Amino acid sequence: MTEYKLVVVGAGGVGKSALTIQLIQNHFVDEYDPTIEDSYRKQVVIDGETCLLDILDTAGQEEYSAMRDQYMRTGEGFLCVFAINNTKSFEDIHQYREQIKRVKDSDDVPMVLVGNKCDLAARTVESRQAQDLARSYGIPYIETSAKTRQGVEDAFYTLVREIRQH
Ligand SMILES: Nc1nc2c(ncn2[C@@H]2O[C@H](COP(=O)(O)OP(=O)(O)NP(=O)(O)O)[C@@H](O)[C@H]2O)c(=O)[nH]1
Ligand SMILES: [Mg+2]
């Protein structure tokens, strides 16, 4: 079976884990539980292909940046997550993307841009701004809510679609 190696990155608190746990476990983690590095595996069907998703859920914290340089090397594709209610997380995307391109030594790494927490009324990042950013990177954009599960599969599965195309 094809194994797709997905890495979830971005600022602390954006919902990297909630996205991942919503995908793998079908449960929304309401809790505060900062990550160091966690890994997940789950068989899924994507466009009719039964495949395995290996997900590496990374810390958002700066403290673990050097840990990200090492353990993201074997990622095949990256979810760059921000929260639509947190403009700083959106600004920080640039730095996570650059790190990934460094780690893979490539300007064209399979990647998606993910605007999470779409369930929240207090949006500070307009959808068109993020769409535009994703266009400027040549990557897909997905809006999600880890809380309601909206877009959760779309975010991971669209990344798998990116991997397949590279
Ligand atoms: N309303 C709402 N809350 C969310 C969503 N995603 C995550 N959260 C909440 O935001 C907080 C942080 O989420 P978490 O998944 O821990 O973020 P992270 O990006 O994995 N944090 P870290 O970088 O420390 O590992 C948690 O209380 C979580 O329930 C969402 O889509 N909607
Ligand atoms: Mg986490």
Side-chain angles (χ1 to χ4, degrees), residues 34-56:
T35 299
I36 308 208
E37 291 210 338
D38 290 326
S39 50
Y40 295 83
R41 302 160 49 77
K42 171 69 167 315
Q43 185 169 285
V44 297
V45 183
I46 306 182
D47 296 332
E49 179 195 21
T50 295
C51 53
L52 183 83
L53 295 186
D54 295 345
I55 302 170
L56 172 64

mmCIF file of all heavy atoms in Angstrom, residues 34-56:
data_model
loop_
_atom_site.group_PDB
_atom_site.id
_atom_site.type_symbol
_atom_site.label_atom_id
_atom_site.label_comp_id
_atom_site.label_asym_id
_atom_site.label_seq_id
_atom_site.Cartn_x
_atom_site.Cartn_y
_atom_site.Cartn_z
ATOM 1 N N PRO A 34 0.364 21.138 24.658
ATOM 2 C CA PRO A 34 1.378 21.474 23.685
ATOM 3 C C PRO A 34 2.171 20.251 23.224
ATOM 4 O O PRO A 34 2.529 19.432 24.012
ATOM 5 C CB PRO A 34 2.336 22.432 24.437
ATOM 6 C CG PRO A 34 1.489 23.017 25.552
ATOM 7 C CD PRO A 34 0.494 21.916 25.902
ATOM 8 N N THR A 35 2.562 20.227 21.983
ATOM 9 C CA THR A 35 3.163 19.004 21.429
ATOM 10 C C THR A 35 4.666 19.130 21.494
ATOM 11 O O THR A 35 5.153 20.216 21.364
ATOM 12 C CB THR A 35 2.806 18.860 19.958
ATOM 13 O OG1 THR A 35 1.399 18.768 19.847
ATOM 14 C CG2 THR A 35 3.451 17.594 19.347
ATOM 15 N N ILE A 36 5.371 18.015 21.611
ATOM 16 C CA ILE A 36 6.801 17.996 21.353
ATOM 17 C C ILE A 36 7.006 17.466 19.945
ATOM 18 O O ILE A 36 7.347 18.237 19.065
ATOM 19 C CB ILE A 36 7.574 17.236 22.458
ATOM 20 C CG1 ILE A 36 7.146 17.820 23.812
ATOM 21 C CG2 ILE A 36 9.076 17.329 22.173
ATOM 22 C CD1 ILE A 36 8.152 17.763 24.953
ATOM 23 N N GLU A 37 6.826 16.156 19.746
ATOM 24 C CA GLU A 37 6.613 15.554 18.414
ATOM 25 C C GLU A 37 5.776 14.313 18.628
ATOM 26 O O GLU A 37 6.127 13.509 19.484
ATOM 27 C CB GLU A 37 7.884 15.143 17.687
ATOM 28 C CG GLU A 37 8.786 16.254 17.199
ATOM 29 C CD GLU A 37 9.559 15.844 15.951
ATOM 30 O OE1 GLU A 37 9.714 14.613 15.720
ATOM 31 O OE2 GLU A 37 10.000 16.765 15.218
ATOM 32 N N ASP A 38 4.694 14.155 17.887
ATOM 33 C CA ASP A 38 3.848 12.952 17.935
ATOM 34 C C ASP A 38 3.650 12.369 16.564
ATOM 35 O O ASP A 38 3.639 13.113 15.602
ATOM 36 C CB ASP A 38 2.477 13.304 18.483
ATOM 37 C CG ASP A 38 2.504 13.660 19.979
ATOM 38 O OD1 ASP A 38 3.306 13.066 20.679
ATOM 39 O OD2 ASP A 38 1.717 14.522 20.410
ATOM 40 N N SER A 39 3.535 11.033 16.434
ATOM 41 C CA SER A 39 3.332 10.445 15.125
ATOM 42 C C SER A 39 2.093 9.546 15.145
ATOM 43 O O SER A 39 1.717 8.982 16.195
ATOM 44 C CB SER A 39 4.568 9.760 14.584
ATOM 45 O OG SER A 39 5.072 8.894 15.542
ATOM 46 N N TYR A 40 1.424 9.553 14.007
ATOM 47 C CA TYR A 40 0.138 8.877 13.799
ATOM 48 C C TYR A 40 0.202 8.093 12.486
ATOM 49 O O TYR A 40 0.942 8.474 11.563
ATOM 50 C CB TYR A 40 -0.948 9.928 13.704
ATOM 51 C CG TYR A 40 -1.169 10.712 14.962
ATOM 52 C CD1 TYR A 40 -0.361 11.819 15.289
ATOM 53 C CD2 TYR A 40 -2.244 10.415 15.817
ATOM 54 C CE1 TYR A 40 -0.577 12.545 16.443
ATOM 55 C CE2 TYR A 40 -2.503 11.181 16.946
ATOM 56 C CZ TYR A 40 -1.654 12.231 17.258
ATOM 57 O OH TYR A 40 -1.835 12.967 18.389
ATOM 58 N N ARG A 41 -0.552 6.986 12.384
ATOM 59 C CA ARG A 41 -0.667 6.247 11.135
ATOM 60 C C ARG A 41 -2.123 5.793 11.016
ATOM 61 O O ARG A 41 -2.753 5.478 11.995
ATOM 62 C CB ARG A 41 0.302 5.038 11.087
ATOM 63 C CG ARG A 41 1.785 5.417 11.253
ATOM 64 C CD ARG A 41 2.679 4.253 11.697
ATOM 65 N NE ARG A 41 2.442 3.063 10.881
ATOM 66 C CZ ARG A 41 2.901 2.880 9.643
ATOM 67 N NH1 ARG A 41 3.662 3.796 9.035
ATOM 68 N NH2 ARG A 41 2.600 1.757 8.996
ATOM 69 N N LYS A 42 -2.686 5.825 9.831
ATOM 70 C CA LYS A 42 -4.098 5.434 9.686
ATOM 71 C C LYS A 42 -4.268 5.100 8.245
ATOM 72 O O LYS A 42 -3.758 5.850 7.384
ATOM 73 C CB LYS A 42 -5.011 6.609 10.094
ATOM 74 C CG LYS A 42 -6.485 6.459 9.798
ATOM 75 C CD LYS A 42 -7.104 5.398 10.687
ATOM 76 C CE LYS A 42 -8.638 5.422 10.648
ATOM 77 N NZ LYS A 42 -9.206 6.799 10.740
ATOM 78 N N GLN A 43 -4.926 3.958 7.972
ATOM 79 C CA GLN A 43 -5.404 3.653 6.636
ATOM 80 C C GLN A 43 -6.612 4.450 6.275
ATOM 81 O O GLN A 43 -7.573 4.545 7.064
ATOM 82 C CB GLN A 43 -5.770 2.187 6.545
ATOM 83 C CG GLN A 43 -6.161 1.716 5.174
ATOM 84 C CD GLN A 43 -6.230 0.203 5.162
ATOM 85 O OE1 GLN A 43 -5.214 -0.459 5.153
ATOM 86 N NE2 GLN A 43 -7.420 -0.319 5.226
ATOM 87 N N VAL A 44 -6.593 4.988 5.050
ATOM 88 C CA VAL A 44 -7.653 5.854 4.591
ATOM 89 C C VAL A 44 -7.890 5.557 3.137
ATOM 90 O O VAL A 44 -7.129 4.804 2.538
ATOM 91 C CB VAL A 44 -7.297 7.367 4.776
ATOM 92 C CG1 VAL A 44 -7.137 7.693 6.219
ATOM 93 C CG2 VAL A 44 -6.054 7.723 3.965
ATOM 94 N N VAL A 45 -8.998 6.096 2.593
ATOM 95 C CA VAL A 45 -9.273 6.030 1.138
ATOM 96 C C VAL A 45 -9.346 7.470 0.613
ATOM 97 O O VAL A 45 -10.144 8.263 1.117
ATOM 98 C CB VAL A 45 -10.547 5.294 0.774
ATOM 99 C CG1 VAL A 45 -10.703 5.228 -0.755
ATOM 100 C CG2 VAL A 45 -10.536 3.871 1.340
ATOM 101 N N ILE A 46 -8.518 7.750 -0.398
ATOM 102 C CA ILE A 46 -8.356 9.048 -0.972
ATOM 103 C C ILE A 46 -8.477 8.892 -2.476
ATOM 104 O O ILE A 46 -7.646 8.213 -3.100
ATOM 105 C CB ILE A 46 -7.016 9.690 -0.621
ATOM 106 C CG1 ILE A 46 -6.809 9.722 0.892
ATOM 107 C CG2 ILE A 46 -6.948 11.085 -1.235
ATOM 108 C CD1 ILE A 46 -5.520 10.385 1.323
ATOM 109 N N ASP A 47 -9.527 9.474 -3.032
ATOM 110 C CA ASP A 47 -9.814 9.358 -4.473
ATOM 111 C C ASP A 47 -9.951 7.852 -4.906
ATOM 112 O O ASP A 47 -9.505 7.419 -6.004
ATOM 113 C CB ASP A 47 -8.714 10.021 -5.260
ATOM 114 C CG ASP A 47 -8.644 11.508 -4.995
ATOM 115 O OD1 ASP A 47 -9.677 12.114 -4.674
ATOM 116 O OD2 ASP A 47 -7.554 12.050 -5.065
ATOM 117 N N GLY A 48 -10.506 7.046 -4.011
ATOM 118 C CA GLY A 48 -10.607 5.596 -4.264
ATOM 119 C C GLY A 48 -9.343 4.774 -3.987
ATOM 120 O O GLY A 48 -9.413 3.534 -4.064
ATOM 121 N N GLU A 49 -8.206 5.402 -3.628
ATOM 122 C CA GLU A 49 -6.985 4.652 -3.293
ATOM 123 C C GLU A 49 -6.910 4.359 -1.791
ATOM 124 O O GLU A 49 -6.965 5.288 -1.047
ATOM 125 C CB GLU A 49 -5.705 5.440 -3.687
ATOM 126 C CG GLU A 49 -4.421 4.714 -3.324
ATOM 127 C CD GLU A 49 -3.167 5.547 -3.340
ATOM 128 O OE1 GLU A 49 -3.170 6.786 -3.258
ATOM 129 O OE2 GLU A 49 -2.147 4.904 -3.478
ATOM 130 N N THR A 50 -6.808 3.085 -1.378
ATOM 131 C CA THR A 50 -6.665 2.743 0.012
ATOM 132 C C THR A 50 -5.193 2.935 0.288
ATOM 133 O O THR A 50 -4.364 2.457 -0.480
ATOM 134 C CB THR A 50 -7.119 1.281 0.293
ATOM 135 O OG1 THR A 50 -8.510 1.195 0.045
ATOM 136 C CG2 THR A 50 -6.897 0.928 1.719
ATOM 137 N N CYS A 51 -4.843 3.778 1.234
ATOM 138 C CA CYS A 51 -3.434 4.118 1.433
ATOM 139 C C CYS A 51 -3.247 4.350 2.899
ATOM 140 O O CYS A 51 -4.235 4.269 3.647
ATOM 141 C CB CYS A 51 -3.047 5.329 0.621
ATOM 142 S SG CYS A 51 -4.119 6.733 0.880
ATOM 143 N N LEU A 52 -2.001 4.530 3.309
ATOM 144 C CA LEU A 52 -1.670 4.721 4.681
ATOM 145 C C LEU A 52 -1.192 6.182 4.820
ATOM 146 O O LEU A 52 -0.337 6.612 4.047
ATOM 147 C CB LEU A 52 -0.601 3.743 5.074
ATOM 148 C CG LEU A 52 -0.244 3.851 6.553
ATOM 149 C CD1 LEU A 52 -1.232 3.064 7.416
ATOM 150 C CD2 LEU A 52 1.184 3.374 6.777
ATOM 151 N N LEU A 53 -1.754 6.928 5.778
ATOM 152 C CA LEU A 53 -1.203 8.260 6.127
ATOM 153 C C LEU A 53 -0.386 8.135 7.370
ATOM 154 O O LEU A 53 -0.919 7.705 8.387
ATOM 155 C CB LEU A 53 -2.310 9.247 6.399
ATOM 156 C CG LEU A 53 -3.167 9.575 5.228
ATOM 157 C CD1 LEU A 53 -4.139 10.663 5.567
ATOM 158 C CD2 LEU A 53 -2.294 10.038 4.097
ATOM 159 N N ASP A 54 0.883 8.519 7.265
ATOM 160 C CA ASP A 54 1.802 8.675 8.393
ATOM 161 C C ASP A 54 1.838 10.144 8.658
ATOM 162 O O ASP A 54 2.281 10.897 7.796
ATOM 163 C CB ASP A 54 3.199 8.317 8.027
ATOM 164 C CG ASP A 54 3.372 6.894 7.688
ATOM 165 O OD1 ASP A 54 2.506 6.034 7.961
ATOM 166 O OD2 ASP A 54 4.434 6.633 7.112
ATOM 167 N N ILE A 55 1.475 10.571 9.854
ATOM 168 C CA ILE A 55 1.424 12.003 10.144
ATOM 169 C C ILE A 55 2.392 12.323 11.245
ATOM 170 O O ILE A 55 2.415 11.655 12.290
ATOM 171 C CB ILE A 55 0.007 12.455 10.450
ATOM 172 C CG1 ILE A 55 -0.921 12.104 9.230
ATOM 173 C CG2 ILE A 55 0.001 13.945 10.778
ATOM 174 C CD1 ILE A 55 -2.353 12.302 9.525
ATOM 175 N N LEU A 56 3.255 13.282 11.000
ATOM 176 C CA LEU A 56 4.164 13.749 12.064
ATOM 177 C C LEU A 56 3.612 15.094 12.496
ATOM 178 O O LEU A 56 3.608 16.019 11.700
ATOM 179 C CB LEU A 56 5.588 13.892 11.560
ATOM 180 C CG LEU A 56 6.578 14.560 12.551
ATOM 181 C CD1 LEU A 56 6.807 13.757 13.831
ATOM 182 C CD2 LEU A 56 7.892 14.855 11.828
#
